[PDB]
Design a protein around this ligand. Structure first.
Ligand SMILES: *[C@@H]1O[C@H](CO)[C@@H](O[C@@H]2O[C@H](CO)[C@@H](O[C@@H]3O[C@H](CO)[C@@H](O)[C@H](O[C@H]4O[C@H](CO)[C@@H](O)[C@H](O)[C@@H]4O)[C@@H]3O)[C@H](O)[C@H]2NC(C)=O)[C@H](O)[C@H]1NC(C)=O
Ligand SMILES: *[C@@H]1O[C@H](CO)[C@@H](O[C@@H]2O[C@H](CO)[C@@H](O)[C@H](O)[C@H]2NC(C)=O)[C@H](O)[C@H]1NC(C)=O
Ligand SMILES: *[C@@H]1O[C@H](CO)[C@@H](O[C@@H]2O[C@H](CO)[C@@H](O)[C@H](O)[C@H]2NC(C)=O)[C@H](O)[C@H]1NC(C)=O
Ligand SMILES: *[C@@H]1O[C@H](CO)[C@@H](O[C@@H]2O[C@H](CO)[C@@H](O)[C@H](O)[C@H]2NC(C)=O)[C@H](O)[C@H]1NC(C)=O
Ligand SMILES: *[C@@H]1O[C@H](CO)[C@@H](O)[C@H](O)[C@H]1NC(C)=O
Ligand SMILES: *[C@@H]1O[C@H](CO)[C@@H](O)[C@H](O)[C@H]1NC(C)=O
Ligand SMILES: *[C@@H]1O[C@H](CO)[C@@H](O)[C@H](O)[C@H]1NC(C)=O
Lengths: 53, 208, 227, 147
């Protein structure tokens, strides 16, 4: 843990189904959800390498 | 896929006592939710996140459980707290747990209703065995056509436990074609209970 | 109060498709998910699907793919936001789809999940049967002549349900038993209804079984006596 | 790394959508001053069975009367941009959702999900927490005010 004065600069982009110009992972792909066996919960996926469009 | 199991199927238990119902999860999870269905009355939420109460649920329903085994308990079992209960995890359900009224044993007064000409003029007649005013609900009611066992031609229905006598009835039928009833003579049923020390039959010989 | 009014009772033939509506009120309709569940008479509950308003995003079961579809109707009034109407279309009906459908909302919460179901609609029964509307006949039941004995009638081969049967029009109510409708004999129901009377009064009185099949306007009256 | 949450020997499949408005069946942008709604049924379509330059084209619609957050009786309008529009972007992440009915099959299916903006922000501010600083404290010692 490290104390920070101000967070890094997030770029507000309003999109659906895909996260554009986001922040990457560090080593591997990070799959991330709340109650994984629950259907109504969305599953957040985060890449370590950007996929261009 | 988680599969939920419940036991006992029917809990026969007297008012004023405790009643403890059981549901068994198959995967070590987190929580469970219970519903109450009062004989056709739009099922209501009872226990919530394994131990919290919903809105309007009285204090006589105490939730409990952990791991793969989860409990329900009604501390002072009333007359209106007889129902059928269900347990739910995310989208998977149990099969049910029925609460009934306990009573001492009794004996049904056996009948045999003869095949009338009123239905045999249409081509299919009804030989109607008919039991009334008994408990327990389970019974092994067999029948015979010319002293020979038949099958596949019967539709038997039970009834529900009454609010005044707390007893049961039963009515079976034996629907055959018009060639088949006049072919035979000796028509009889068979009745067999925990509360009878002897098999009881009654008869109606056709034409006699 | 959180109301959920579901309509309505439907009888259809196999191969058809039904649309069932579910009107909600008393809360902001654009905020809360709406589950759809089905209650089989001999298999228990079964979760059909799940609709989220404000955009209409849906998900279904995986055994009900290719058949179900559901949408909503958002109230557009700047001075009345608290109502809304949901829908559900359940196509590809077969007779094994006959059950009672519900439209279930959760409650307000801090520490729980989505599936705990607090507010319940009244439900509606969707019958799928190839039988057509037919009246009941009536057939007497009695002994030939101390101990109590069963008078009664037989109300055989009708469609659809329910038959309301009264006795001597209609004050003879004690000792009266009814059975639930005997299942489909080629698509048609029957009802047994017997009344226990001491065997002295069999040879005295004339007894009447008053069948009232209301959806076909059929009415019959058989006299019951020891033949 | 889905298979570490479900099982090694499972089959993982991707489907495309099951209904809704244009805001949740498709991929929304905000680039260059216009509002694109692209059809992504060509990306989320494959199976997985546990063992150069050709680009995938995505057709795309345009509309200029949008209603964001679906407030009653309110709508916006984007003025047209003079000239053709060009954009370059990276895709860093997805929002899937799982179907899950009660059957016995070994085949999971994952679909992209849409309309709630709190998944765009909760996927970025996840490593933070705000704390309060309480300066006073008490501790026993051998000090004695000296009367
Ligand atoms: C994801 O991030 C990328 C990387 O930044 C981002 O791409 C950027 O898009 C903006 C869109 O505004 C680009 O800015 C334009 O760039 C062109 C390049 O020639 C300029 O001509 C533009 O100048 C005009 O700007 C206004 C438009 O009307 C006018 O008022 C003005 O007078 C000029 O005519 C403008 O600078 C930007 O260059 C790119 N970045 C890079 C590195 O190319 C992308 O938009 C992000 N994704 C999303 C969905 O937003
Ligand atoms: C992808 O989604 C589209 C619609 O979002 C589906 O398209 C339908 O496909 C069926 C064929 O099975 C057609 O009869 C329908 O007319 C199509 N819908 C529309 C709106 O045109 C499609 O099935 C999905 N899956 C794949 C693999 O393409
Ligand atoms: C999104 O794109 C898919 C194809 O990439 C569309 O599917 C087509 O639907 C039309 C409508 O009948 C068919 O004629 C085509 O044959 C379909 N294509 C394929 C490959 O099956 C889909 O309809 C598009 N989405 C919407 C909403 O129109
Ligand atoms: C979109 O992705 C590209 C690819 O990472 C980013 O461009 C740079 O690419 C080089 C590859 O030679 C990397 O070493 C750099 O770290 C990348 N970033 C920078 C700032 O140079 C591009 O920056 C990405 N877009 C955004 C908005 O970050
Ligand atoms: C999801 O997991 C969290 C972890 O703390 C738990 O508190 C919660 O009860 C779980 N939700 C459900 C619906 O089981
Ligand atoms: C699945 O694969 C992982 C890969 O290391 C292994 O650790 C794990 O034991 C496997 N599980 C089963 C049930 O085979
Ligand atoms: C979906 O997958 C099938 C099978 O691989 C493929 O033939 C079809 O082209 C795909 N759909 C689109 C829109 O690319």
């Amino acid at each position: 843990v490290s104390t920070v004065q101000c967070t890094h600069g997030i770029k507000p982009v309003l999109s659906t189904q895909l996260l554009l110009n986001g922040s990457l992972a560090e080593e591997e792909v990070m799959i991330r959800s709340e109650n994984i066996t629950n259907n109504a919960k969305n599953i957040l996926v985060q890449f370590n390498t950007p996929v261009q469009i | 896929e988680i599969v939920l199991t419940q036991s006992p199927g029917i809990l026969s238990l007297s008012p004023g006592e405790t009643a403890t119902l059981f549901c068994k999860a198959s995967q070590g999870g987190n929580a469970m939710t219970w519903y109450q269905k009062r004989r056709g009355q739009v099922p209501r939420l009872l226990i919530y996140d394994t131990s919290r109460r919903a809105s309007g649920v009285p204090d006589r329903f105490v939730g409990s459980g952990s791991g793969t085994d989860f409990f329900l308990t009604i501390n002072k079992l009333d007359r209106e707290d007889f129902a059928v209960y269900y347990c739910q995890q995310f989208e998977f359900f149990g099969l049910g747990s029925e609460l009934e009224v306990h009573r001492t044993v009794a004996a049904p007064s056996v009948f045999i209703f003869p095949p009338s000409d009123e239905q045999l003029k249409s081509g299919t007649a009804s030989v109607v065995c008919l039991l009334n005013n008994f408990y327990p609900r389970e019974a092994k009611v067999q029948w015979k056509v010319d002293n020979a066992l038949q099958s596949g031609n019967s539709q038997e229905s039970v009834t529900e436990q009454d609010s005044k006598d707390s007893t049961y009835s039963l009515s079976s039928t034996l629907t055959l074609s018009k060639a088949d009833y006049e072919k035979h003579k000796v028509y009889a049923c068979e009745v067999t209970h925990q509360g009878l020390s002897s098999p009881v039959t009654k008869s109606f010989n056709r034409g006699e | 109060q959180v109301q959920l009014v579901q309509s309505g009772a439907v009888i259809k033939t196999p191969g058809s498709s039904v649309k069932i509506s579910c009107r909600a009120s008393g809360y902001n309709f654009r905020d809360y998910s709406i589950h759809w569940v089905r209650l089989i008479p001999d298999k228990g509950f079964e979760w059909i699907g799940w609709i989220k308003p404000l955009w209409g995003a849906v998900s279904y079961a995986r055994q009900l793919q290719g058949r179900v579809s559901m949408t909503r109707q958002l109230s557009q009034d700047p001075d009345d936001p608290d109502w809304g109407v949901a829908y559900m279309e359940f196509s590809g009906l077969t007779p094994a789809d006959t059950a009672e459908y519900f439209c279930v909302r959760r409650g307000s919460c801090d520490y729980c999940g989505d599936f705990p179901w607090q507010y319940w609609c009244q439900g509606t029964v969707v019958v799928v049967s190839s039988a057509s509307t037919k009246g009941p006949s009536v057939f007497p039941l009695a002994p030939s002549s101390g101990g109590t004995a069963a008078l009664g009638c037989l109300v055989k081969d009708y469609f659809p349900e329910p038959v309301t049967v009264s006795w001597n029009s209609g004050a003879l109510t004690s000792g009266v038993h009814t059975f639930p409708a005997v299942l489909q004999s080629s698509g048609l129901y029957s009802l047994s209804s017997v009344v226990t009377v001491p065997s002295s009064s069999l040879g005295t009185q004339t007894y009447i079984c008053n069948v009232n099949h209301k959806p076909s306007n059929t009415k019959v009256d058989k006299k019951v006596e020891p033949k | 790394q889905l298979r570490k949450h479900f099982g090694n020997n499972t089959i993982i499949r991707f489907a495309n959508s099951s209904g809704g408005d244009l805001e949740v069946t498709t991929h929304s942008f905000n680039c260059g001053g216009e509002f694109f709604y692209c059809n992504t049924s060509g990306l989320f379509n494959s199976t997985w069975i546990s063992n150069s330059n050709d680009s995938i084209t995505l057709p795309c619609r345009i509309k200029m009367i949008i209603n964001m957050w679906q407030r009653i009786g309110q709508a916006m309008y984007a003025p047209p941009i003079q000239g053709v529009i060009r954009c370059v972007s990276n895709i860093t992440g997805l929002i899937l959702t799982r179907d899950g009915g009660s059957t016995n099959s070994t085949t999971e299916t994952f679909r992209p999900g849409g309309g709630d903006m709190r998944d765009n922000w909760r996927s970025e501010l996840y490593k933070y927490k705000v704390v309060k600083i309480e300066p006073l404290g008490v501790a026993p010692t051998r000090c004695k005010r000296r009367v």
